[PDB]
Design a binder for these strands. Structure first.
Ligand SMILES: COc1c(N2C[C@@H]3CCCN[C@@H]3C2)c(F)cc2c(=O)c(C(=O)O)cn(C3CC3)c12
Ligand SMILES: COc1c(N2C[C@@H]3CCCN[C@@H]3C2)c(F)cc2c(=O)c(C(=O)O)cn(C3CC3)c12
Ligand SMILES: [Mg+2]
Ligand SMILES: [Mg+2]
Ligand SMILES: [Mg+2]
Ligand SMILES: [Mg+2]
Lengths: 245, 487, 487, 247
DNA sequence: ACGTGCATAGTCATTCATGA
DNA sequence: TCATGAATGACTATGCACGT
């Protein structure tokens, strides 16, 4: 068991449960999203750490500069473990580390910067499956009489719309289907009922299979060699749609 | 270089600031209970179509529209004013429908302008009801490009409902919010008893307005302070939150605070208790835990020691925290461009007067527009009775001006009427269409007679205020939140 | 809970970011030379009516309109983008007419959004010319509420004119600005010699585009770098400011810098000289004084020591400061949704292709609308020829549909024609108005004949591009600013 | 008497002049970062310095002295003027013989002027007594004639006067662009500020004079003091007659 | 000394590629 | 290491009156 703040980052909205095994850290993109997340959370088991701005690339940046970064210190401190050789999983303050970013591309980019931080400084957190990715909603279907439904894809949107109409429900063509363009646009209630309620949230657990293959990919994508990255993007962007086919 | 004495400069400059702040910034107009920034936001959103019958527009568009046409000040503080009008813990009756993160009763600040969307609420639509029928005076904006309203129709007593607080120069206001249904009763009485003197009116209105009704619920302790505010325009109203004592399986007792008095920051409240214990001055408390959530609302659990009495600890909280705190009422509002401290019967009366003004002006506007149309229709009917001639006359005219001048001479009609005949489509020459014009004339002359009747009878005018207000209250009126108890 | 491999996540996420940044953020479309934010700001201003024929609107209204409908990002950085497009030292041909403080070539930041006003410039109106005539493909915005243009008509070669600089992923662009009159000559040649191969075209275009033309004037030293940039898509162009040696009364030779190379901060430049002097890297300098003002422009006076040669000190300034600095050209633009490094002949050719597309599409749109209007007029002329019958038929009709159906039977007309007749006003039955209808039909059939001729002859299509662009250059074209010298 | 100007121990926001002679130097105390920015650009950098003040100035009448000296904006003024305050005041060390207060024409500009004039009268009175303090009068209107040079107006009256004369003279204005109305210094560019408030050959300055020192002491205490009641009765008593102070 | 609400925005740190 | 330019806003201090 570990003490919660009521010696940690100022932006950390810690949980109440003193058991790491039962605790969860939501690393959130933006002060706005983090603010509403702080309100909709379960304050017992869920803590919020809002990260502001693009995270520093630890692959590119010198080590001393990374340690001066206010946002990295927030993560390293709030996780408690330590980094590199001084890493100690025993001091992990949250056994669930959920990265929650916007569905847009800059959200995707921030996650790749965080996954890089974790893989390089605190790799065992990934290997032992403590790192997760929350999937935010893309749409909110606001039925005229029925309860609202949330969708996490264009496909699911079309599916819930079709089913509902077939079931005799109806929607306004003005208000209609609210489309989320980021977590910042969501209020406390919406975030709970889509990303933080453990009975309905869609989490993805980051797994690490081939460590050597991962090591090279991180260096190619996040490294200082532009040439290697430029040829990689031109080589593989052509086939991103077919990675899971 | 001209010389100026420091006394002349200081006096002129500071008085100009104080007067503008007093009349045109910090204090509410008595008729609609709005400050200039409030009124200008709402009209901007209204004119922009940001209404409840359409989806929320990005709130940035409301700020920018306000800035560009009406409110020559900063986007930052204007956004703050808009956000406030959308918070259910600030306004007893929110005027803005916010979408997104608009903050909390604690220290959680609202999301930035870019993240949030907003539109007018249905009640705010009653603030602006029939503003387009010359129901209120308009003046040119800050650069004469466009017109802005001096006051809103305000078809529900907004000043008393949502209250107002403002710091001006030499003075400040602090009007608490009230329950709409209770205010409506006061207005209904004021309409029926329109001849009653101030002495009788104050007695009646105080009987119906039982006291302020805060959006944050809570308790009002005592009746003296409330009575003072209504008879004096000043009064200290003691508020309390609600505390429920819970017992534990072991046996230990804990206090649960689920409501706090109006305008008490939840985070500052919890911190104050912690800091007093940590200072060691609220003994008997064993632990402070905020079990609040979006789903249970406010829930501050104060576990107390076994050698501690629940009420002793509660009384200490009343004494040393804002669990019990007073509302300094000061009924200050601008009346006819002048700041005035008002009695409760004055606040109602002035509002009722405003409603009657609004409806007489609306009636006047409709009567004028009815007469204009009735006069254009009369011209068309003349044309139909001589339709054979009318057409042949236009056909046999070189220009349209020659056709027009001919129409006046033939049918003995105005140039406005003759124009309407010319502007008439070949559609309306159909049999059933000729008949619509006839019936419409008959339809309007009945409406003109009705409208003339309303203006001639103060009884009907008062009835319209009553009947229209009753509709609003039946729609948007809600239960009381703040419970009133005695000492 | 679903499992995901870190390699799969990293690759998909980073590629998606890289591709969006590349195609939809950092790099310009080759046809109009605009990035998404530019295109959306300008269209927002255009659609809001913020045009040169109306007074400057508050810039907040442009940001909000862009943000609310087209550009789902922060108000802050969008304002920066709008501001930049209004600065004469940034854009060679500003697209925004700024009113107020928009900063300076030094460290003076622009005024906040609240203090500034803005509208489109006449040249920006040429970017958007006839966009409402289906000249470019439109797609739904970020939430499908409204349509936005994929590219602007861009009736002057904006990419080459105003240039572009952008940092993407895996690549970056840096296209210098050019003199409009020189670009037009290149375009005129490309139109005349439309069959010319790339080898000939590149030779011709390079002869007319003598080199970059920076808004900050200055000098271009050498011709190799310019030649490389146009043949390779990459080249290092050596720039210089202008230095004039003045001699004093007491005898105090001093260097006066009145121009600096493109994108050199005035304040950072002075600071660099000042810091490299007290350090011991620029001996011979005695004193640095900034005699710049709004009325004389840039004027940095560098007094040199008496035992110092002016030319020695100037070469030292060339070496150790940005008084001489290179422009790293990298002609990268998005071509058909794909990033491409282009030769100068490709940049011109691709633009000419776009202009021809715009005019063929404009002609097709006008021909369609002409046929529709012609059709309706043909119906009206039939009605006038049988005007006696038309009227008597509508009078004796129960409904308008019965009158309509009758008109079809009488004149053998479409339902669109009969409706147009029905909607006709008695206005138009006057003699001159009946004749106006006749002549209008004749006018269109002449215009239809013209339009059909345009579509059938590529010669005329090219002619329209030339003639219309020529008009634009004669009005908005200006002298060269950057002087080109040899080694 | 000459003093060094900053060029790559004075306030950071200060944009100092080049002239080392105080007798020829001028300090423009400006309201707002935007306006101060434009002033820095439109000025004559030889004789004119700019000090932008941000936000409403602290009331030295109400606040304790220790709090006033901790205020970043007051420290900037006291430092830039160089003299010192109260008993340690030394006019000999005055770095500018012209201290121009430039605020918006709006009501909030007037308020800032009273807060600055209070600071000067209480901390550095001799600057007022010796006529070193001035008030710049910003323009209210810019008349943009179609063919002729644009004219600036400093009142509703002058606007009406210049408009009539020009129209009578055969000039013309657009009814769209037309007459630009300034709502603050922040809306002006560098050129406009030069041609109305900073160019010494056309600027409209007012020199602050001090006649009755005892009466001034009382007015300052009434308007700016901690006594609200005294201020409330004074405003209600005299606001009714502000229009008629110069009739 | 703190809260209140309408008024009077610059500063601060990263991604990303390239050349000094 | 710094500039470039679109991307990912909270904090900082005064006026003003009033009550604990
Ligand atoms: C620089 O002025 C402001 C400060 N400053 C006051 C002090 C001055 C020196 C720097 N430190 C503080 C910061 C502040 F803290 C907040 C705001 C503010 O919120 C605001 C708005 O439109 O909402 C507008 N302004 C500006 C119009 C002046 C604010
Ligand atoms: C808080 O993030 C920002 C910083 N901060 C990032 C760092 C975090 C810790 C504190 N220090 C830095 C400051 C900054 F300096 C500038 C901007 C900024 O300009 C901006 C915009 O709309 O233009 C938007 N944002 C936010 C959307 C992220 C900025
Ligand atoms: Mg986002
Ligand atoms: Mg503010
Ligand atoms: Mg920014
Ligand atoms: Mg102002």
């Amino acid at each position: 068991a570990l003490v919660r703040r009521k010696g940690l980052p100022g932006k950390l909205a810690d949980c109440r449960s003193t058991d790491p095994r039962k605790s969860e850290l939501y690393v959130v993109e933006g002060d706005s999203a983090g603010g509403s997340a702080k309100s909709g959370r379960d304050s017992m088991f869920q803590a919020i750490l809002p990260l502001r701005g693009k995270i520093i690339n630890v692959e590119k940046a010198r080590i001393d500069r990374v340690l001066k970064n206010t946002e990295v210190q927030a993560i390293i401190t709030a996780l408690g473990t330590g980094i590199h050789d001084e890493f100690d999983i025993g001091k992990l303050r949250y056994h669930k580390i959920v990265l929650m970013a916007d569905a847009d591309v800059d959200g995707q980019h921030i996650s790749t910067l965080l996954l890089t931080l974790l893989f390089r400084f605190m790799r065992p957190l990934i290997e032992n499956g403590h790192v997760f990715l929350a999937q935010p909603p893309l749409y909110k279907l606001k039925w005229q009489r029925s309860d609202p439904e949330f969708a996490y894809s264009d496909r699911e949107r079309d599916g819930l719309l079709e089913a509902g109409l077939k079931a005799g429900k109806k929607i306004n063509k003005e208000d209609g289907i609210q489309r989320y363009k980021g977590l910042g646009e969501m209020d406390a209630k919406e975030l709970w009922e889509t990303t933080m309620d453990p009975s309905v949230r869609v989490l993805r657990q980051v797994t690490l299979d081939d460590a050597a293959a991962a090591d090279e990919l991180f260096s190619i994508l996040m490294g200082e060699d532009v040439d290697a990255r430029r040829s990689f993007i031109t080589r593989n962007a052509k086939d991103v749609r077919f990675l899971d086919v | 270089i001209e010389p100026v004495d420091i006394e002349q400069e200081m006096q002129r400059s500071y008085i100009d600031y104080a007067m503008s702040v007093i009349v045109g910034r910090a204090l509410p107009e008595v008729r609609d209970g709005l400050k200039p920034v409030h009124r200008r936001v709402l009209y901007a959103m209204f004119d922009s179509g940001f209404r409840p019958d359409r989806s929320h527009a990005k709130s940035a568009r409301s700020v920018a529209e306000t800035m560009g046409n009406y409110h020559p000040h900063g986007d930052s503080s204007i956004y703050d004013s808009l956000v406030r009008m959308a918070q259910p813990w600030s306004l007893r009756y929110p005027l803005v429908d916010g979408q997104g993160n608009f903050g909390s009763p604690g220290n959680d600040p609202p999301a930035a302008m870019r993240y949030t969307e907003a539109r007018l609420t249905p009640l705010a639509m009653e603030m602006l009801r029939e503003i387009d029928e010359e129901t209120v005076d308009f003046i040119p904006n800050y650069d004469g490009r466009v017109q802005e309203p001096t006051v809103l129709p305000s078809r529900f007593p907004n000043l008393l409902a949502n209250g107002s607080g403002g710091i001006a120069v030499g003075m400040a206001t602090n009007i608490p919010p009230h329950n709409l249904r209770e205010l409506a009763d006061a207005v209904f009485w004021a309409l029926e008893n329109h001849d009653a003197d101030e002495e009788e009116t104050l007695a009646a209105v105080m009987g119906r307005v039982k006291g302020p009704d805060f959006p944050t619920a809570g308790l009002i302790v005592g009746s003296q302070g409330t009575a003072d505010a209504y008879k004096t325009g000043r009064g200290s109203i003691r508020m309390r939150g609600v505390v429920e004592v819970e017992e534990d399986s072991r046996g230990r007792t804990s206090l649960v605070i689920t409501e706090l008095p109006y305008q008490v920051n939840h985070d500052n409240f919890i911190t104050s208790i912690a800091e007093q214990v940590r200072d060691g001055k609220l003994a008997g408390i064993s632990n402070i835990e905020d079990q609040s959530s979006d789903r249970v609302g406010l829930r501050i659990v104060i576990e107390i020691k076994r050698d501690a009495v629940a009420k002793v600890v509660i009384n200490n909280l009343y004494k040393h925290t804002q669990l019990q705190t007073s509302f300094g009422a000061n009924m200050l509002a601008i009346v006819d461009g002048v700041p005035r401290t008002l009695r409760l019967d004055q606040l109602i009366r002035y509002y009722v007067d405003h409603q009657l003004d609004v409806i007489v002006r609306r009636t006047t506007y409709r009567l004028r527009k009815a007469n204009e149309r009735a006069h254009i229709l009369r011209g068309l009917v003349k044309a139909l009775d001589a339709l054979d001639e009318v057409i042949a006359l236009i056909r046999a005219s070189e220009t349209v001006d020659i056709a027009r001048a001919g129409l006046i001479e033939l049918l003995d009609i105005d140039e406005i009427q003759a124009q309407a005949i010319l502007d008439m489509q070949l559609r309306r020459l159909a049999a059933l269409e000729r008949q619509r014009i006839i019936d419409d004339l008959a339809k309007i002359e009945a409406e003109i007679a009705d409208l003339e009747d309303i203006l001639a009878k103060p009884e009907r005018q008062r009835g319209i205020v009553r009947d229209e207000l009753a509709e609003i209250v039946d729609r948007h009126g809600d239960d009381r939140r703040t419970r009133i108890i005695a000492i």
